[PDB]
Enzyme design. Structure first.
Site, mmCIF file in Angstrom:
data_model
loop_
_atom_site.group_PDB
_atom_site.id
_atom_site.type_symbol
_atom_site.label_atom_id
_atom_site.label_comp_id
_atom_site.label_asym_id
_atom_site.label_seq_id
_atom_site.Cartn_x
_atom_site.Cartn_y
_atom_site.Cartn_z
ATOM 1 N N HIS A 1 -27.305 -111.334 -53.057
ATOM 2 C CA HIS A 1 -27.020 -109.903 -52.790
ATOM 3 C C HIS A 1 -25.557 -109.715 -52.384
ATOM 4 O O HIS A 1 -25.124 -108.545 -52.310
ATOM 5 C CB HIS A 1 -27.998 -109.321 -51.773
ATOM 6 C CG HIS A 1 -27.809 -109.744 -50.355
ATOM 7 N ND1 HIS A 1 -28.576 -110.736 -49.769
ATOM 8 C CD2 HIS A 1 -26.983 -109.283 -49.396
ATOM 9 C CE1 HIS A 1 -28.184 -110.892 -48.526
ATOM 10 N NE2 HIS A 1 -27.225 -110.018 -48.269
ATOM 11 N N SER B 1 -25.025 -112.280 -43.654
ATOM 12 C CA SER B 1 -25.609 -112.646 -44.971
ATOM 13 C C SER B 1 -24.836 -113.804 -45.620
ATOM 14 O O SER B 1 -23.600 -113.769 -45.648
ATOM 15 C CB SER B 1 -25.612 -111.463 -45.915
ATOM 16 O OG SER B 1 -26.751 -110.649 -45.729
ATOM 17 N N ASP C 1 -32.982 -115.428 -53.144
ATOM 18 C CA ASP C 1 -31.686 -114.814 -52.766
ATOM 19 C C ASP C 1 -30.623 -115.902 -52.599
ATOM 20 O O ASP C 1 -30.262 -116.216 -51.440
ATOM 21 C CB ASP C 1 -31.889 -113.963 -51.512
ATOM 22 C CG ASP C 1 -30.707 -113.057 -51.203
ATOM 23 O OD1 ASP C 1 -29.752 -113.011 -52.023
ATOM 24 O OD2 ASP C 1 -30.743 -112.412 -50.131
ATOM 25 N N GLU D 1 -4.611 -120.284 -38.352
ATOM 26 C CA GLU D 1 -5.620 -121.368 -38.471
ATOM 27 C C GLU D 1 -5.005 -122.516 -39.268
ATOM 28 O O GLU D 1 -5.095 -122.553 -40.496
ATOM 29 C CB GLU D 1 -6.917 -120.837 -39.091
ATOM 30 C CG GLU D 1 -7.574 -119.721 -38.294
ATOM 31 C CD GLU D 1 -8.138 -120.117 -36.933
ATOM 32 O OE1 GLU D 1 -8.486 -119.199 -36.145
ATOM 33 O OE2 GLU D 1 -8.240 -121.342 -36.663
ATOM 34 N N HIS E 1 -14.012 -125.182 -35.682
ATOM 35 C CA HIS E 1 -14.073 -126.137 -36.821
ATOM 36 C C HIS E 1 -15.281 -127.071 -36.664
ATOM 37 O O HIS E 1 -15.324 -128.081 -37.398
ATOM 38 C CB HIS E 1 -12.737 -126.875 -36.998
ATOM 39 C CG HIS E 1 -11.565 -125.949 -36.970
ATOM 40 N ND1 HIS E 1 -11.355 -125.001 -37.940
ATOM 41 C CD2 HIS E 1 -10.575 -125.784 -36.070
ATOM 42 C CE1 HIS E 1 -10.276 -124.296 -37.650
ATOM 43 N NE2 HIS E 1 -9.788 -124.749 -36.504
#
Lengths: 223, 165
Positions: free
Chosen positions: A41, A177, A86, A61, A10
């Site tokens: 993308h 990504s 992007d 969690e 965290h």
């Protein structure tokens, strides 16, 4: 993340997991109670987004939220030219309550400084070609525009910047990504692309240059 | 938007796994290397009836995502992720025309896309990463089907993960 280590749980409360049938494919970054920034993308017609995670099992969690989103806005100049611009904004179905484990981050207004050591975090592939169980963190240094354009010619565009390519082979990898690059406590970049395979010595990865897009982000999110 | 899927409906991976391109109408033939004429080495990509299931490929994008979409420019290559000696490209050679051939060099961004077509997918070649794509189809010669630009006459494939190995 190549040659990083487990993040402190965290420590990156803006990190978002983009999952598709319980598999992570991308990350994003909470930049507003109702919006996640990611790479264009990574676009999908709808998303399941994990906030407040460390491992990718929400029920392990405390404080985590799996939320739905159907709306995304890709930057209008995405891929013009190829690989450039992007970024995209995902609107959550509901705004999210801030906590100690779920928090937005501001975007840098200043453009990246060469030599600056920055942090990248994600759940993408490790050096051994496996997926990690918990969020990984690694430090990479911003590289000059001159080295970036030399290495990525003829596709370099100012919507991009390079970081990493040290001797210790630290890099982002597949699955990273859309995740954050933090410099001096601000969101500076998103993991975008690099050379395959990842982690090659002297080969930095490419990040979306978010200082170029603060007006577009602010205008989209305030609407 | 459009994720490329294998024959089990799973997303095709970016580089990490190899896949057989299984022709829907030439299933008796598998991907292989051959000579077109009198060149010294076999570097033309063909469907050969004598090779089943054939050479599997990897699809590679520089994007740091672990799946492949139909909108991504791809390198397509034979062999492991580590090697760049089986990378597909297109070279004029009479009498095939614009033939698909392997090279040992790779651009960052490859010239191919995988697009939905009929029962499966076609490979589309974009010279100079432009806006206009040319279908990859088949030229029959010497008891093989040479992969070549044949716009409007795509070879259609299904994509089978090579986990059998």
């Amino acid at each position: 993340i190549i040659n990083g280590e487990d993040c402190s749980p965290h420590s990156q409360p803006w990190q978002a997991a983009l999952v598709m049938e319980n598999e992570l494919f991308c990350s994003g970054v909470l930049v507003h109670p109702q919006w996640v920034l990611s790479a264009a993308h990574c676009f999908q017609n709808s998303y399941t987004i994990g906030l407040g995670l460390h491992s990718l099992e929400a029920d392990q969690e405390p404080g985590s939220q799996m939320v739905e989103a159907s709306l995304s806005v890709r930057h209008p100049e995405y891929n013009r030219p190829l690989l450039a611009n992007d970024l995209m904004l995902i609107k959550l179905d509901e705004s999210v309550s801030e906590s100690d484990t779920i928090r937005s981050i501001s975007i840098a207004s200043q453009c990246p400084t060469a030599g600056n050591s920055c942090l990248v975090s994600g759940w993408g592939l490790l050096a051994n070609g496996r997926m990690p169980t918990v969020l990984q963190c690694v430090n990479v240094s911003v590289v000059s525009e001159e080295v970036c354009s030399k290495l990525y010619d003829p596709l370099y565009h100012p919507s991009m910047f390079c970081a990493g390519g040290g001797q210790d082979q630290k890099d982002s990898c597949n699955g990273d990504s859309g995740g954050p690059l933090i410099c001096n406590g601000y969101l500076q970049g998103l993991v975008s692309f690099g050379k395959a395979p990842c982690g090659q010595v002297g080969v930095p990865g490419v990040y979306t240059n978010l200082c170029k897009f603060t007006e577009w982000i602010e205008k989209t999110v305030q609407a | 938007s459009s994720v490329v899927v294998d024959t089990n409906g799973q997303p095709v991976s970016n580089g990490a796994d190899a896949y057989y391109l299984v022709p829907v109408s030439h299933g008796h033939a598998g991907l292989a290397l051959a000579k077109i004429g009198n060149e010294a080495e076999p570097r033309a990509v063909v469907l050969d009836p004598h090779h089943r299931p054939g050479l599997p490929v990897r699809f590679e994008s520089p994007l740091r995502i672990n799946i492949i979409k139909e909108s991504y420019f791809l390198n397509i290559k034979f062999g492991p992720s580590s090697s760049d000696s089986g990378v597909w490209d297109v070279i004029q050679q009479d009498p095939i025309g614009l033939a698909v051939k392997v090279t040992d060099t790779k651009s960052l961004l490859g010239p191919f896309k995988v697009e939905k077509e009929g029962e499966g997918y076609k490979i589309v070649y974009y010279p100079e990463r432009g806006q206009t794509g040319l279908d990859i189809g088949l030229v029959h010669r010497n008891d093989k089907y040479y992969l070549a630009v044949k716009d409007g006459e795509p070879c259609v494939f299904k994509i089978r993960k090579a986990t059998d190995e």
